[PDB]
Design a protein around this ligand. Structure first.
Ligand code: NA
Ligand SMILES: [Pt+2]
Length: 60
């Protein structure tokens, strides 16, 4: 089912749609087609989801 990624650099959500992430975190990439710039991700460990800037995520 799930496309995976690894977070490269810390990012703090500034808007309610965004997801705060830490360098090294594992995510699921829920969508990367609506925008090359904003990907919807879900943290494996917490289950929280939101948008992150795409350059913060390295697909696995
Ligand atoms: Na994209
Ligand atoms: Pt901050």
């Amino acid at each position: 089912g799930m496309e995976r990624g690894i977070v490269q650099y810390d990012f703090m959500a500034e808007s309610q749609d965004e997801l705060t992430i830490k360098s090294g975190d594992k995510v699921y990439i829920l969508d990367d087609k609506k925008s090359k710039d904003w990907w919807m991700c879900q943290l494996v460990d917490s289950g929280k989801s939101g948008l992150v800037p795409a350059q913060f995520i390295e697909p696995v």
